[PDB]
Amino acid sequence: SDLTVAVVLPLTNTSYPWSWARVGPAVELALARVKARPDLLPGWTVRMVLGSSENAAGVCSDTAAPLAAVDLKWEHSPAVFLGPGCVYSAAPVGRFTAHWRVPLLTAGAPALGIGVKDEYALTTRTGPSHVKLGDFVTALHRRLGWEHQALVLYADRLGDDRPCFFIVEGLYMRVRERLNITVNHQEFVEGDPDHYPKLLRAVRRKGRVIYICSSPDAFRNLMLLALNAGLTGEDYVFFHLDVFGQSLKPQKPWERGDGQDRSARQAFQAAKIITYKEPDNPEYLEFLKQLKLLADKKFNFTVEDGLKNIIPASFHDGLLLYVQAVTETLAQGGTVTDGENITQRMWNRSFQGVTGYLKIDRNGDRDTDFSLWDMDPETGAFRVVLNYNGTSQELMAVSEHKLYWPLGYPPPDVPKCGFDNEDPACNQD
Amino acid sequence: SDLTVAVVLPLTNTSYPWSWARVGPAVELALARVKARPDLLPGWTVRMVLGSSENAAGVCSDTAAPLAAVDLKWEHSPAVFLGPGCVYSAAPVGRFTAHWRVPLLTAGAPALGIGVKDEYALTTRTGPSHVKLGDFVTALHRRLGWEHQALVLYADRLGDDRPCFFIVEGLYMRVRERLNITVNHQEFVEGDPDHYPKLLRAVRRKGRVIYICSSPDAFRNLMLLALNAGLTGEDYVFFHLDVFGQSLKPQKPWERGDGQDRSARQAFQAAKIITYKEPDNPEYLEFLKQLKLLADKKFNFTVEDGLKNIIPASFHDGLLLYVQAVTETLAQGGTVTDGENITQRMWNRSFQGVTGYLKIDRNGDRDTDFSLWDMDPETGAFRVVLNYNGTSQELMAVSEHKLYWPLGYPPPDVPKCGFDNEDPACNQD
Ligand SMILES: *[C@@H]1O[C@H](CO)[C@@H](O[C@@H]2O[C@H](CO)[C@@H](O)[C@H](O)[C@H]2NC(C)=O)[C@H](O)[C@H]1NC(C)=O
Ligand SMILES: *[C@@H]1O[C@H](CO)[C@@H](O[C@@H]2O[C@H](CO)[C@@H](O)[C@H](O)[C@H]2NC(C)=O)[C@H](O)[C@H]1NC(C)=O
Numbered sequence A, B: 001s002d003l004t005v006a007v008v009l010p011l012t013n014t015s016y017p018w019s020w021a022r023v024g025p026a027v028e029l030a031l032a033r034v035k036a037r038p039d040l041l042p043g044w045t046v047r048m049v050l051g052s053s054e055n056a057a058g059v060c061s062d063t064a065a066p067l068a069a070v071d072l073k074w075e076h077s078p079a080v081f082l083g084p085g086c087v088y089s090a091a092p093v094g095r096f097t098a099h100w101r102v103p104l105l106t107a108g109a110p111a112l113g114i115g116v117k118d119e120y121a122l123t124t125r126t127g128p129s130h131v132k133l134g135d136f137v138t139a140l141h142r143r144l145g146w147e148h149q150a151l152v153l154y155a156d157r158l159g160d161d162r163p164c165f166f167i168v169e170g171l172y173m174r175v176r177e178r179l180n181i182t183v184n185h186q187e188f189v190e191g192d193p194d195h196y197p198k199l200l201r202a203v204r205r206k207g208r209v210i211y212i213c214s215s216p217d218a219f220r221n222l223m224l225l226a227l228n229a230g231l232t233g234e235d236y237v238f239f240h241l242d243v244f245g246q247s248l249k250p251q252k253p254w255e256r257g258d259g260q261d262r263s264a265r266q267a268f269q270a271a272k273i274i275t276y277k278e279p280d281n282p283e284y285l286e287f288l289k290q291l292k293l294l295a296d297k298k299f300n301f302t303v304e305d306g307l308k309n310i311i312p313a314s315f316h317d318g319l320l321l322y323v324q325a326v327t328e329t330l331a332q333g334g335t336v337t338d339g340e341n342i343t344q345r346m347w348n349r350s351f352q353g354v355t356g357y358l359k360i361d362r363n364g365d366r367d368t369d370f371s372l373w374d375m376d377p378e379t380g381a382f383r384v385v386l387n388y389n390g391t392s393q394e395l396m397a398v399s400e401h402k403l404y405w406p407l408g409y410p411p412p413d414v415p416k417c418g419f420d421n422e423d424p425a426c427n428q429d
């Protein structure tokens, strides 16, 4: 019998981490593995039906995706949906699959709202989610003694899936929930020179521990401006929330060869970069090789190296986790459409996949690991100094390296005389 | 053969102008008329299948409505959808019906966005729409010589269909488009005493011709505060955007018997009320009688008098207009599922219904008539002095009455020395 998987992803646009040009070969690799395991899905064959989350303009849409999901549902009666990856596309589709009582698996849709499973019943996220970034920051603040305040600056592109907004929204709610610190925040538009005076003023007025979600160039410009304004590593720390490591390729993220590298290097003495952790089990490197090969040969697409590859790898691992859950359900006398039973076997469970160890929490979302990159004083090069395990919630040093603090130890998150020092008797020096 | 009409409306909640307790009897009345007209729908019988736009909490929802529409579509293959009425419910349903190429008729969903028919293809609105309010204001400003500025203040209830927001959004875009005046605007929360200082300051600083969308009590309080601050009818005019005439029951909207009626009457010398026009053809009064009777006997609901009744009357008239369009389509050899052909016969067309004359514009939206209520100097009572025909776009005086201006003529929309008079030489007096 056929186990039909309904896919709703960007079938023609290849620019997303979850675009079919990347996810398609990853899924094919997972299915080829299933076919070679007679113990898996005894008596069933996995079949795929494809639908696109894209509108006429070629971008993931909050309307095209649900229209596609309904069409697939009606025509093929799928047992499970794979995707969408975009937050705006997955929100409406997930409400339909919940209503239909059909599981939905995705390594995308990291937004806070998708985490409300009373609404998104049967939605299992096998990739990163933004509230998990909040868990990492919570751990960082506790380890460094920051219990009072932080500022978050962020920018996105006019009409996209608003990645930075959702990153900050998840970080904000979770950090506020666990640390109860004041979290000031504000958006800006990267190409608007009018916003720089406001940002620099907000940095001085509202925070000492600062998080910035922006392009690599916007972060570098802000650091150069901070250095020129005399905001150094003794009093400030700037964390670039660069989950996919776009500013990384030794790593010298401050280098451009534009006549400002000496200043940029100096300015980065006060910066650290937060990224998803690069899987480092040997099975991942082999998957990457097979992924690139198949993507090139059967999907006409060149898959470049980078952290974005954890997404298709997570669709691969998630589909295998689902397969295991269904195999166990059949074994116990249930069937492939027992949505609740199958989902219950995926949540609050560990699994070994190409991305290594992976744990799905009790709310149906995968625990996410992060890496903190810091500067090597001697060379100015950046390297990972701390890794965060999202399951144990422990921060572990890497290679005996210690965190770099320009003049000693971490700056306090509140200035000696407060942010709005109005006490003539308090000497800020 | 059966012509199936899929309904997606509030089936259990009776508080909406488009709730089934009101719309259901209105539709029944229209169907009984069709059954008595053998010339209509030769060989077809209209059948109704019902779905609710309500979520578990009993309010119209942006999710329950489309889930219901899909369920109805699948199970009954309807030829046309009736409803939703709520803006948040109709937006997603309309995108589905457009995709399915099935007509959607509604006397609700007045929001600006629903007017983009490239998206909401086949959606025909037979009731009021908010951009039409913009047409009325345009006409008013031209007649009174207001070519520069206006201020709009508005408030809604925490999680409703945000009626005032959509009213102002439609007014703003259309007025800006046709007059190119500056339109300042701002929201407030009615029960928050903290907002009154800000509102009164914005009135002084930003406008002389002011529009307010709020509850009857919030408008009265604002008028009493304006009078106390010395803002009179010589320099200010306050238009209460009360489309359904909630502040009306002679009409003395300023009366409460709370010890402030003398002041309230005086304060209202500077106020006028904008409402939808009450249909005044004899067929409307008879429809109202039949509606109340049937609603009480078959739907267990007491239909009170009021302008909200134009909504069920417009679902009644719209369904008959649709019937006429389909009858003509059949006559020409087409069939009940020729969505485009049927819709084309409804747009840019006049029709006679219980609400009297009704014209559907070229964009598929009904032209809306409005009434302006003004104070009678002698009694302080309010009465209609001007009526606006949305098709001809002409303003016509009623009963030889003229507009009331406390001290002569309309106040100018810009103060003599400008809003921020900084010219020491200009005497505001
Ligand atoms: C594929 O997706 C990308 C990203 O969404 C599209 O690029 C954007 O296109 C929109 C138009 O809808 C522009 O307003 C943005 O400036 C573009 N942003 C980025 C980051 O590229 C792209 O056009 C889509 N289509 C194709 C064929 O690639
Ligand atoms: C992250 O931390 C968790 C600790 O809970 C590690 O999970 C354990 O992994 C071992 C070996 O895979 C299992 O035998 C245990 O059952 C796991 N414990 C739990 C509670 O699930 C996990 O290995 C760590 N991740 C990495 C990359 O080291």
Ligand SMILES: *[C@@H]1O[C@H](CO)[C@@H](O[C@@H]2O[C@H](CO)[C@@H](O)[C@H](O)[C@H]2NC(C)=O)[C@H](O)[C@H]1NC(C)=O
Binding pocket: B013, B014, B015, B057, B058, B059, B060, B157, B158, B159, B160
């Ligand atoms: C029917 O609809 C009304 C209006 O939407 C509901 O009343 C609101 O209920 C919400 C809860 O979802 C409250 O937050 C609001 O304060 C209420 N506003 C108003 C104007 O009533 C009502 O509860 C719904 N259900 C029923 C049975 O009437």
Ligand SMILES: *[C@@H]1O[C@H](CO)[C@@H](O[C@@H]2O[C@H](CO)[C@@H](O)[C@H](O)[C@H]2NC(C)=O)[C@H](O)[C@H]1NC(C)=O
Binding pocket: B350, B356, B357, B359, B389, B390, B391, B392
């Ligand atoms: C609103 O104005 C329009 C003027 O265009 C009136 O419409 C005319 O109505 C008469 C009688 O019903 C028809 O013979 C004409 O064909 C209509 N003209 C057009 C252009 O459609 C309409 O009657 C007015 N409304 C009211 C209540 O008087």
Ligand SMILES: *[C@@H]1O[C@H](CO)[C@@H](O)[C@H](O)[C@H]1NC(C)=O
Binding pocket: A180, A181, A182
């Ligand atoms: C959270 O901390 C702030 C001060 O940092 C305090 O005012 C507030 O009361 C705390 N939260 C709660 C729920 O008390």
Ligand SMILES: *[C@@H]1O[C@H](CO)[C@@H](O)[C@H](O)[C@H]1NC(C)=O
Binding pocket: B180, B181, B182
């Ligand atoms: C609209 O009017 C304003 C001043 O009232 C003017 O500055 C503006 O240029 C006008 N619109 C356009 C498109 O020129």
Ligand SMILES: [Cl-]
Binding pocket: A008, A009, A010, A018, A053, A060, A083, A084, A085, A086, A089
């Ligand atoms: Cl997607």
Ligand SMILES: [Cl-]
Binding pocket: B008, B009, B010, B018, B053, B060, B083, B084, B085, B086, B089
């Ligand atoms: Cl509705």
